[model samples]
Target: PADNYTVCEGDNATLSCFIDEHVTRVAWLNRSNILYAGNDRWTSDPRVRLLINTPEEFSILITEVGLGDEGLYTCSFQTRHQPYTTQVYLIVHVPARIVNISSPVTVNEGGNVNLLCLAVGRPEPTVTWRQLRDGFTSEGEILEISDIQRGQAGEYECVTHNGVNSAPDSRRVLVTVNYPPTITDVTSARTALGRAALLRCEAMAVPPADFQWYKDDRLLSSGTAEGLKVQTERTRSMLLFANVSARHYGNYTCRAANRLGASSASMRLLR
Candidate 1:
């Protein structure tokens, strides 16, 4: 039998010795040439268990491993050919608690911002940032904040890795670019009979935009435009009546919006 078998502290393990052929007998030998029995220092060795699973193999299973049990172990398998032996060594390693990054919880549209992810572990874990879109990514660890917009408003994710092990974290920030509604026909307030009066409301937002009209903070029912009207650019608008009415007598507001954020503006209207 081989001289030694090693196991980690506080771990359950087994030592095995096998023959290449059918075995007639198997014995566990100690350093002192003593037969193994439930006696002496071997008594109360509750962790050791032995089994003969096949004609050629003998196995030992240890439970609730202890440091004092670390030593040389001899396993002998008596077969028609000769006695067979083997050895095993175990080295234990501990895993470290990972580190983390915090702060910069919020970001603004068209504004600069910073995001960070950190971790502490064995072998110095590497951190990475991903936009989680078909859009874009950077080789650097920090997601450089710039030209913040609505298309960039999805979840931002960070992944940390320690060679074999890794973890991920994510956060969401709403980028709101606030702008007041721009009114058309600034000076032309009165509409004579039979003349058309066009009141235009415009605002800009990223995407999935909304447009609506309001008078004196009260939502308008007559002006049918929802916050925005389609334009040539990334702007939204609302069209008021072609025929003016006395009811259009207060401030008109337009709001542009998306799931990520919204913007608004208002202007006075004359009857």
Candidate 2:
């Protein structure tokens, strides 16, 4: 038959013929006997050449091809006897598509977070996670975020690569670290002297927030730092008095703050 061939679109197609007699020449015919790579539109490529290795075998190379080239192709070999003829079909196939991820999120300070990246392309694109500052590659597709802090608040990117002819896709995420301080504990007391009272304040915060003390709804700035000691870890504050009077026997407040947020606690002194 003249059109005995099958193929998919966009395939690197090759037509060949084998004969026992000495072959003299070879020719290819497409639909309507139209020769491929003959017109200016389908000009032959130097890389896509034909070769006659022997009287019984011949081959053709199609480089960087397209789908329109798919169809019934004929291989004609001229020998000492009758002309040998055969045909084959061609088909070109495309790859699969990739997925995508969202961006611009926040994580609590000293907490854990998860970020994702999306990909869209052929041949099941491979997802890769990269950290820009360190430029480190991850083991798999997704990236795991943990122990987040102000230092960890920055830009994160994910890239995808496909084995096929499609270009890679990329996604970026910006994570901000935020959290409020916490008043873990607090205590207050009055001395036997009755003239001066002692108040102790304790709390916890990230970045070791600054601590402030207030008495009777007013700022009490008349004591030594030892009178208002502030601890970084425990965030403890102690109020002292050289002349503790009724004025210092009112409501006292302890406050802690950081860039993210602040926390405070209050206690009343009784004599």
Candidate 3:
């Protein structure tokens, strides 16, 4: 018989012992206890059974093998000449399984964030962190991000693997970064009387910025004044005056806002 045998958990395992001569008595022992004697099973475990007990062949079958079933096993028999024995070691392997993973998290810019990953297995699994977007990779049970920024916001994957497992297990966590709106590139145009004038403002913000136009501390809505049009996009806002006049010559403010905070930029237009 081979010195050792390996089997996966929750699987059937068989151990065989061959004899050349007829034996009056044959017994199988697992470490200290006699698991099988002659044609009778000594252990109360139903999963253990004596499959074959003959003069030429002797074998035992273990159904649904578990971690506790791994140990030294001995096959002993008495022959006409003397006592003979053979030993075999059983090794059971349990695949890795992810038990818990961090949930989606939200953090402000320049903040710190930490994520945890956990797994269970017989030999213990190794944890790894990977950013699916950029192919960024790190190895550890805890993923730490300091001074978080908008560029670092994305889906992060936690992977666990062990040699005993057929494939690695992975979990995803989404990180969202929130920041105040920032306004830039405020431009004003001066035009002749009765000529069109344009005022433009651009902003960068997290979660997308909403725009509102104000003139001299008064909110300007669509149709609020004649010859006045407010055009808005994702990051840019424009205030268009169909005709330049004294009434339209004032300080124009572009206010960009989001869930986090608000920012404003002002440009003066004179005719």
The alpha-carbon RMSD values of the candidates against the true structure, listed in the order shown, are: 8.6, 10.1, 4.3
Score residue 112 of candidate 3 by CA lDDT.
94
Q: In model 2, which range of ten residues has the least summed lDDT?
A: 34-43
Off by over 4 Å in 2: 1-24, 30-47, 51-53, 78-86, 96-261, 265-271
- What is the Cα root-mean-square deviation between model 3 and the actual structure? 4.3
Better-scoring candidate (TM-score), 2 or 3: 3
Prediction 1 global C-alpha lDDT: 0.51
Instruction: Give the per-residue lDDT digits (tens) of candidate 1, residues 175-269.
Output: 33433333322222455644554445445444435666556666655524533222222453544455555555556666666556566655665
Give the clashing pairs for model 3: none
**Tens digit of per-residue lDDT, candidate 2, span 57-131:** 656656555656666676666776777668776544444233656568766787887776655442456787776
Candidate 3 per-residue C-alpha lDDT over 1-271 given as tens digits, one digit per residue, 9 for 90 to 100: 6497888789999988888756878888899899888788699999888888778888999999998999999988888779988999999877777788899999999999998888877777888988877788888888899999878889999988878736786789998888877886889887778788888888878778899999888878868455688998878888888866677887878899999899887788876
The candidate maximizing lDDT is 3
The residue ranges of model 1 lying beyond 4 angstroms of the native Cα positions read: 1-16, 20-55, 62-85, 89-104, 109-114, 120-124, 134-151, 162-271
> What TM-score, over all chains together, does every model reach?
0.45, 0.40, 0.73
- On a 0 to 1 TM-score scale, where does candidate 1 land against the true structure? 0.45
- Cα deviation of 152 in candidate 2 (Å)? 16
